[PDB]
């Protein structure tokens, strides 16, 4: 599949702790090039060149209906999550 437009995302449920040392979130998409792949990244605050988002949901995707569900595991410390143009701070452990 092709990548979604990064400028057409909105938070549906902001990231929260899952209860088993992972992070879960939900987004919505207003583009018409569906279905498409969601771009997901995360970095340690001090090292912005290395992706540390270990995904539990493989290849998150926006279908022809519904939103998107994403779950990831992050290393301890201060991190930043990127989903398209959306962003969120997350402190782990």
């Amino acid at each position, epitope marked *: 599949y092709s990548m979604c437009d990064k400028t057409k995302f909105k938070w549906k449920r902001v990231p929260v702790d899952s209860g088993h040392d992972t992070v879960v979130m939900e987004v919505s998409y207003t583009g018409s090039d569906k279905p498409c792949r969601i771009p997901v*990244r*995360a*970095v340690a605050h001090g090292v912005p*060149t290395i*992706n540390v988002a270990m995904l539990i949901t493989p290849n998150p995707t926006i279908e022809t209906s519904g939103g998107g569900f994403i779950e990831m595991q992050l290393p301890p410390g201060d991190n930043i999550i990127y989903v398209g143009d959306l*962003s969120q*701070q997350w402190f782990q452990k």
Partner: antibody, heavy 124, light 107 residues
Framework: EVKLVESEGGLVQPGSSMKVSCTAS????????MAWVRQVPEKGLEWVAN????????YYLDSLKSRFIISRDNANNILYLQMSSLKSEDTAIYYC?????????????????WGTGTTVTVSS | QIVLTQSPAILSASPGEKVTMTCRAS?????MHWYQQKPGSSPKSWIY???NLASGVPTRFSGSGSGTSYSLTISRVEAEDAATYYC?????????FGGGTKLEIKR
């Protein structure tokens, strides 16, 4: 939408100083590196400076490192450029710009949003 | 600092035909980026990381290259493509911009 709006420029005498600013809206400002780039008459585009998330690291073009200072105020969504000991060679259009590419090596990074621009003229 | 050579300085083409503009670097780089600028407004991200299209850019555009030679190609030019296009490298400090290629559309 993501938007960057620069302040007013103006005319200044050689050797004097001036401060310009850039106001951001539509995104979480503290989650992006930011930069300044200028367009010089009859020479093209030239990078000036950039700064990390919290302002603890700054980088400059070598021929400008003594005359320019970049800084930011994350709670008020604003980026600054302070100029001093200005020369005539500093007359240009100055653009605010947001960096993108996190999670990849530095050679991958680029400028994904640009400001409207403001003009600074150094003359007697 | 790495010197970037864009050619031609002015590219003139008839509507519907395919065109290619080139950007050569004085030393090797691992990615090249491209920006579009129209008179009276600021530059705009057009292609990033050699071959990825920015949001809103028509799929008639594409980009390619490696090492010391990169390029941007339009499959079928249209009147709204008239503008100046700049290349940029961020592999060596300081980052640098090319001199630009201005695209003219015949009528």
């Amino acid at each position: 939408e993501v938007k960057l709006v620069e302040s007013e420029g103006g005319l200044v005498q050689p050797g004097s100083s001036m401060k310009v600013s850039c106001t951001a809206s539509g995104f979480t400002f503290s989650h992006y590196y930011m930069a300044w780039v200028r367009q010089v008459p009859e020479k093209g585009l030239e990078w000036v400076a950039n700064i990390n998330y919290d302002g603890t690291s700054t980088y400059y073009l070598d021929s400008l490192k003594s005359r320019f200072i970049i800084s930011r105020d994350n709670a008020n969504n604003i980026l600054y450029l302070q100029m001093s000991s200005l020369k005539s060679e500093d007359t240009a259009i100055y653009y605010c710009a947001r960096e993108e590419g996190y999670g990849n090596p530095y050679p991958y990074w680029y400028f994904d949003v640009w400001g409207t621009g403001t003009t600074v003229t150094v003359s007697s | 600092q790495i010197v970037l050579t864009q050619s031609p300085a002015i590219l003139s083409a008839s509507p519907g035909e395919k065109v290619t503009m080139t950007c050569r670097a004085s030393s090797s780089v691992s990615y090249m980026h491209w920006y579009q600028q129209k008179p009276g407004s600021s530059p705009k991200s057009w292609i990033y990381a050699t071959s990825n299209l920015a949001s809103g850019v028509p799929t008639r555009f594409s980009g390619s290259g490696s090492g010391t030679s990169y390029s941007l190609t339009i499959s079928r030019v249209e009147a709204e493509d008239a503008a100046t296009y700049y290349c940029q490298q961020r592999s060596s400090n300081p980052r640098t911009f090319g001199g630009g290629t201005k695209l003219e559309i015949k009528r």
